[PDB]
Amino acid sequence: DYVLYKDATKPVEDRVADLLGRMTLAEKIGQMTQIERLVATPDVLRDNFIGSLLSGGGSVPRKGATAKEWQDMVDGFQKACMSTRLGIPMIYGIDAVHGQNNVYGATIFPHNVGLGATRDPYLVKRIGEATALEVRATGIQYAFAPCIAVCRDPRWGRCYESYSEDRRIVQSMTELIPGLQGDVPKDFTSGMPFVAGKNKVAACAKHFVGDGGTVDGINENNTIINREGLMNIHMPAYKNAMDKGVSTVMISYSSWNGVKMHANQDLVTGYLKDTLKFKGFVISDWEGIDRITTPAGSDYSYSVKASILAGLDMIMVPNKYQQFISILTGHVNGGVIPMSRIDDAVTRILRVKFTMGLFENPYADPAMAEQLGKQEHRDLAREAARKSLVLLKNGKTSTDAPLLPLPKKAPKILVAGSHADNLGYQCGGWTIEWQGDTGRTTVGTTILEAVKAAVDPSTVVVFAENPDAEFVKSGGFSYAIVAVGEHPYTETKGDNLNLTIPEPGLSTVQAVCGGVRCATVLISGRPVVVQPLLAASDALVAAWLPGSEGQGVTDALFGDFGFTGRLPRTWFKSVDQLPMNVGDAHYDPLFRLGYGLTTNAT
Ligand SMILES: *[C@@H]1O[C@H](CO)[C@@H](O[C@@H]2O[C@H](CO)[C@@H](O[C@@H]3O[C@H](CO[C@H]4O[C@H](CO)[C@@H](O)[C@H](O)[C@@H]4O[C@@H]4O[C@H](CO)[C@@H](O)[C@H](O)[C@H]4NC(C)=O)[C@@H](O)[C@H](O)[C@@H]3O)[C@H](O)[C@H]2NC(C)=O)[C@H](O[C@H]2O[C@@H](C)[C@@H](O)[C@@H](O)[C@@H]2O)[C@H]1NC(C)=O
Ligand SMILES: *[C@@H]1O[C@H](CO)[C@@H](O[C@@H]2O[C@H](CO)[C@@H](O[C@@H]3O[C@H](CO)[C@@H](O)[C@H](O)[C@@H]3O[C@@H]3OC[C@@H](O)[C@H](O)[C@H]3O)[C@H](O)[C@H]2NC(C)=O)[C@H](O[C@H]2O[C@@H](C)[C@@H](O)[C@@H](O)[C@@H]2O)[C@H]1NC(C)=O
Ligand SMILES: *[C@@H]1O[C@H](CO)[C@@H](O[C@@H]2O[C@H](CO)[C@@H](O[C@@H]3O[C@H](CO)[C@@H](O)[C@H](O)[C@@H]3O)[C@H](O)[C@H]2NC(C)=O)[C@H](O)[C@H]1NC(C)=O
Ligand SMILES: OC[C@H]1O[C@@H](O)[C@H](O)[C@@H](O)[C@@H]1O
Ligand SMILES: OC[C@H]1O[C@@H](O)[C@H](O)C[C@@H]1O
């Protein structure tokens, strides 16, 4: 007879109910299961009725894979899923968190902290738009973004993934969501999922909740704050996300007052689902349910019970799907987890899939491949990089001529420092590899390349990575641009109690600026100890992690545009002050939140 769920003209809720009513337990639990492409095969996907796949950081079909290679990979998986009895298409997720960043040749946008510096939500919306296109270029339908953490301590390795320590700024930047997904209709009910169609992607507000509030910025640790503080600081942007139709929410590894978020029924079900009326699906973090216990994974049966009863809908396993499916099936058969809970999880997963058009367009569009690294998107990244820059110093005394903007015509100039010609360093973590990497890892323009592209043809440009003082004094230079800062990092590898940049960095700045007037470009994911760098430098720019388009940096250095970025975080005098956020009683910053010098275009 007629099969309602296969009818594209029918309301989503009717299609959901019609399909749900046909499904076996195995088919239901399969929808709730997300697995790594590294463990996926056609038989696995078909036999286990798998609902989702992902690429974790650096999980790629081949180094240097083309957009079409990604499309072929995703379509291969999709063909297996579509060959099941019910033909429910899988959704494929990836961390596209500053562009489609795992992919070779994808445009790499500034990380969130720099976007916060721009105070420009419309810019961020347009970045969401470009990112959706580059993700769809690779056949992928689901981005694990935005991170709406409010980082309250820059010792956290994910501080760069937070737009600001100020929740108001984070709330404003939720505009990423309608960029990625499309704008919601005028009729729209807050909490409903939304994706406009095949040229957009499902988004994910993460990580719920208080991931940016952990003690001493220890990643995945305990957020110790009363309910009033949680609701006033860490929660608000989730409400904006509901209002904008975010399709999914990912749960945090962190705990709130000692209760694991992955086990917190009060917050996941009581608040997110029952109070905020969230109707999309809730996904775990990577082995998030494993990490409920100490040691992690030492009671996986408990992990499954606790997380599913808490209200999680989809589990990012991501590897041991056999164990997950077996345990969950056992719990349901034994009445420990009710069918109502399973049906709710599946209802939400199917709701997102039908809403976004996945049943109508389960396969990649080969015409989209050329969206990857498209020059217009690079022009946008370049605009964002330039707007993110915060000018902290522009002259050593009130009597000095401002160093910036620099003249494009000079007899000879010096470009120096570990970060002047290192594309991987300027992109930071979550670029090609999970932890990021060093050197020419993708298509882009380094600061050195940007300088050479900007200056008058008569200007001789000399590069020296770590010149000594004599080299500089003898070189006949008009000025120097020197770039130094943090190495790429992600998650726990970035947790750092001292926040001092690696050497050589300061020593290079001192040697260069001791010999010639010098503009220091600081590449970092966060405020770092900066007084010594300031003391040496004529001008100093906090460039954050500006991404693949290094010309954004030189657009401001050479006065094509004026500096406009303002600190989205407090710049501390010392790490012993931390945590120290705007509005605190003891507030003694080196530079307050919102500080930034300006220049005018030449
Ligand atoms: C303040 O606290 C932070 C965080 O705890 C700490 O930085 C970490 O230091 C760890 C211990 O030294 C270090 O762990 C080791 O890393 C070894 C390899 O590390 C290189 O490669 C990784 C990426 O794989 C980078 O992240 C590292 O920064 C490092 O990179 C190299 O650095 C040098 C020096 O600038 C540079 O010339 C190279 O080009 C560059 N290479 C690349 C590929 O980029 C590894 O072999 C060991 O087994 C061990 O795991 C950890 O990586 C680092 N974390 C970071 C930077 O995120 C600071 O202490 C150290 O800083 C490092 C860079 C080094 O100079 C040490 O001597 C410092 O003590 C702390 N600062 C203090 C205490 O002053
Ligand atoms: C020389 O540089 C000056 C410093 O940047 C610049 O003056 C600033 O101009 C900007 C842009 O017009 C002003 O920003 C606006 O401020 C408004 C008042 O609150 C807001 O309602 C606007 O939205 C806008 O705010 C920006 O929005 C985008 C966001 O990303 C930014 O963070 C946010 O600031 C800013 O207030 C001015 N600042 C000061 C101290 O005056 C000069 O621009 C001039 O250009 C004229 C045409 C006019 O815009 C004037 O405001 C301004 O004097 C610039 N001078 C020249 C000649 O270019
Ligand atoms: C927040 O972070 C702290 C610091 O890492 C966590 O405390 C640490 O927890 C681990 C266990 O996961 C402890 O390690 C254990 O040590 C004993 C020996 O005493 C050993 O038998 C075990 O094999 C294991 O290695 C560690 O000692 C402990 N550190 C401190 C300083 O307390 C804490 O659990 C985190 N909190 C949350 C909520 O995530
Ligand atoms: O790669 C999938 C996930 O991995 C986790 O470890 C990170 O916490 C998430 O932000 C990410 O989305
Ligand atoms: O975020 C944690 C990361 O761990 C890595 O080992 C994996 O590639 C996936 C995941 O993205």
Burial of 364 from C-beta contacts in 10 A (0-12 / 13-18 / 19+): buried
How far is C-alpha 384 from the geometric centre of its chain's CA atoms? 15
**Cα distance between residue 595 and residue 119, in whole Å:** 12
Cite the DSSP H helix spans in 271-400.
Answer: 300-310, 321-333, 339-355, 375-388
Cβ within 8 Å of residue 263, ≥6 positions away: 292, 306, 307, 310
Residue nearest to ligand 1 atom 53, measured at CA: 493
598 alpha carbon to ligand 2 midpoint, in Å?
Answer: 10
Q: Which ligand is nearest to the CA of 391?
A: 2
For the chain, how many structural domains are there in total? 2
- Asked if 59 and 155 sit in the same domain, the reply is yes
Q: Are 512 and 482 contacting, i.e. CB atoms less than 8 angstroms apart?
A: yes
What does DSSP assign to residue 189?
Answer: P
**146 CB within 6 A, ligand 4:** no
Choose the residue to mutate in 211, 221, 299, 495 for probing ligand 3, maximizing ligand atoms within 8 Å of C-beta. Answer: 221
Atom of ligand 3 nearest to the CA of 253: 39
Q: Are 346 and 32 contacting, i.e. CB atoms less than 8 angstroms apart?
A: yes
- Asked if 342 and 453 sit in the same domain, the reply is no
Atom of ligand 2 nearest to the CA of 565: 32
Catalytic residues: 285, 491
**Cα distance between residue 397 and residue 244, in whole Å:** 47
Pairing relation of β-strands 281-283 and 259-260? unpaired
Does residue 496 form part of some domain? Answer: yes
Tokens of 12: 């989503």
**3-class state of residue 484 by DSSP:** strand
- Asked if 157 and 267 sit in the same domain, the reply is yes
- Asked if 395 and 369 sit in the same domain, the reply is no
Choose the residue to mutate in 38, 52, 151, 286 for probing ligand 4, maximizing ligand atoms within 8 Å of C-beta. Answer: 286
**Cα distance between residue 124 and residue 380, in whole Å:** 10
Q: Are 75 and 364 contacting, i.e. CB atoms less than 8 angstroms apart?
A: yes
Q: Using alpha carbons only, what angle is made at residue 526 by residues 103 and 592, rounded to the nearest 5 degrees? A: 140
Cβ within 8 Å of residue 420, ≥6 positions away: 446, 447, 448, 463, 465, 481, 482, 483, 521
Q: Which ligand is nearest to the CA of 147?
A: 4
**3-class state of residue 416 by DSSP:** strand
**Cα distance between residue 210 and residue 223, in whole Å:** 6
**Cα distance between residue 178 and residue 183, in whole Å:** 5
Q: Are 208 and 248 contacting, i.e. CB atoms less than 8 angstroms apart?
A: no
- Asked if 379 and 296 sit in the same domain, the reply is no
Residue among 466, 465, 446, 464 nearest 454 (CA): 446
Burial of 335 from C-beta contacts in 10 A (0-12 / 13-18 / 19+): exposed
Q: Are 53 and 34 contacting, i.e. CB atoms less than 8 angstroms apart?
A: yes
SS3 of 108-177:
CCCCHHHHHHHCCHHHHHHHHHHHHHHHHHCCCCEECCCECCCCCCCCCCCHHHCCCCCHHHHHHHCCHH
DSSP per residue, 434-463: TT--SS--SS-B-HHHHHHHHS-TT-EEEE
**Cα distance between residue 530 and residue 500, in whole Å:** 8
The amino acid sitting at 18 is D
285 alpha carbon to ligand 4 midpoint, in Å?
Answer: 6
Does residue 594 form part of some domain? Answer: no
Long-range contact set of residues 1-5: C-beta below 8 Å, sequence gap at least 24: 5/354, 5/359
**Cα distance between residue 4 and residue 15, in whole Å:** 6
Cβ within 8 Å of residue 372, ≥6 positions away: 67, 100, 103, 105, 106, 134, 137, 138
Choose the residue to mutate in 120, 560, 564, 567 for probing ligand 2, maximizing ligand atoms within 8 Å of C-beta. Answer: 564
The amino acid sitting at 433 is E
**Cα distance between residue 372 and residue 514, in whole Å:** 43
How many angstroms separate the Cα of 338 from the Cα of each of 202, 309, 429? Answer: 28, 9, 41
- Asked if 292 and 412 sit in the same domain, the reply is no
HSE-up of residue 191 (Cα within 13 Å, Cβ side): 10
Residue nearest to ligand 5 atom 10, measured at CA: 56
Which of 373, 390, 423 is a domain's end point?
373
Report the CATH number that the domain containing residue 227 is assigned in CATH.
3.20.20.300
* Partners of 413 in beta bridges: 461
- Asked if 369 and 386 sit in the same domain, the reply is no
561 alpha carbon to ligand 2 midpoint, in Å?
Answer: 12
Q: What share of the chain is helix, strand, coil (3-state, %, to 5)?
A: 40, 15, 50
With tokens 């494993």, the residue in question is 290
Does residue 326 form part of some domain? Answer: yes
Q: Are 88 and 29 contacting, i.e. CB atoms less than 8 angstroms apart?
A: no
Q: Are 592 and 577 contacting, i.e. CB atoms less than 8 angstroms apart?
A: no
- Asked if 443 and 368 sit in the same domain, the reply is no
With tokens 């989730």, the residue in question is 238
Q: Are 169 and 240 contacting, i.e. CB atoms less than 8 angstroms apart?
A: no
Atom of ligand 4 nearest to the CA of 204: 12
**Cα distance between residue 571 and residue 292, in whole Å:** 34
Does residue 582 form part of some domain? Answer: no
Q: Domain limits at 201?
A: 1-373
Tokens of 15: 């299609």
Does residue 597 form part of some domain? Answer: no
How many angstroms separate the Cα of 488 from the Cα of each of 62, 458, 552? Answer: 22, 35, 19
Task: Report the structure determination method.
Answer: X-ray
Residue 514 host element (H or E):
none
Residue nearest to ligand 4 atom 1, measured at CA: 56
Tokens of 211: 């991931």
With tokens 């690079």, the residue in question is 378
**Cα distance between residue 327 and residue 198, in whole Å:** 35
- Asked if 384 and 416 sit in the same domain, the reply is yes
Q: Are 208 and 284 contacting, i.e. CB atoms less than 8 angstroms apart?
A: no
Tokens of 306: 């606790």
593 alpha carbon to ligand 4 midpoint, in Å?
Answer: 28
The amino acid sitting at 71 is Q
496 alpha carbon to ligand 1 midpoint, in Å?
Answer: 11
How many angstroms separate the Cα of 421 from the Cα of each of 115, 215, 256, 446? Answer: 22, 36, 42, 5
- Asked if 334 and 419 sit in the same domain, the reply is no
What does DSSP assign to residue 433?
Answer: B
Residue among 382, 456, 468, 444 nearest 413 (CA): 456
**3-class state of residue 542 by DSSP:** strand
HSE-up of residue 214 (Cα within 13 Å, Cβ side): 28
Tokens of 197: 């169609």
Residue 423 host element (H or E):
helix 423-427
Q: Are 482 and 518 contacting, i.e. CB atoms less than 8 angstroms apart?
A: yes
**3-class state of residue 91 by DSSP:** strand
Report the CATH number that the domain containing residue 509 is assigned in CATH.
3.40.50.1700
The amino acid sitting at 513 is C
Residue among 525, 529, 476 nearest 506 (CA): 529
**286 CB within 6 A, ligand 4:** yes
Strand order in the sheet with 52-55: 142-143, 91-94, 52-55, 33-36, 315-316
| Ligand 3, pocket residues at CB < 6 Å | 218, 220-222, 255, 294
How many angstroms separate the Cα of 85 from the Cα of each of 89, 344, 568? Answer: 11, 21, 51
Which of 357, 373, 389 is a domain's end point?
373
Pairing relation of β-strands 52-55 and 33-36? parallel
231 alpha carbon to ligand 5 midpoint, in Å?
Answer: 29
Q: Using alpha carbons only, what angle is made at residue 291 by residues 286 and 294, rounded to the nearest 5 degrees? A: 160
Residue among 202, 176, 201 nearest 281 (CA): 202
Atom of ligand 2 nearest to the CA of 600: 1
What does DSSP assign to residue 8?
Answer: T
**57 CB within 6 A, ligand 4:** yes
HSE-up of residue 143 (Cα within 13 Å, Cβ side): 33
Does residue 577 form part of some domain? Answer: no
- Asked if 387 and 280 sit in the same domain, the reply is no
Residue among 52, 40, 255 nearest 140 (CA): 52
596 alpha carbon to ligand 2 midpoint, in Å?
Answer: 13
502 alpha carbon to ligand 1 midpoint, in Å?
Answer: 7
Burial of 225 from C-beta contacts in 10 A (0-12 / 13-18 / 19+): middle
**Cα distance between residue 12 and residue 359, in whole Å:** 11
Does residue 588 form part of some domain? Answer: no
Which of 350, 373, 396 is a domain's end point?
373
DSSP per residue, 197-255: STTS-B-EEEEETTGGG-GGG-TT-EE---HHHIIIIISHHHHHHHHTT--EEEEPSSE
Atom of ligand 2 nearest to the CA of 387: 30
**Cα distance between residue 416 and residue 419, in whole Å:** 8
- Asked if 269 and 392 sit in the same domain, the reply is no
**Cα distance between residue 193 and residue 195, in whole Å:** 7
Q: Which ligand is nearest to the CA of 206?
A: 4
Tokens of 322: 């056999």
Pairing relation of β-strands 255-256 and 259-260? antiparallel
Does residue 567 form part of some domain? Answer: no
The amino acid sitting at 421 is D
Residue nearest to ligand 2 atom 35, measured at CA: 564
Upstream peptide bond of 405 is cis (omega within 30 degrees of 0): yes
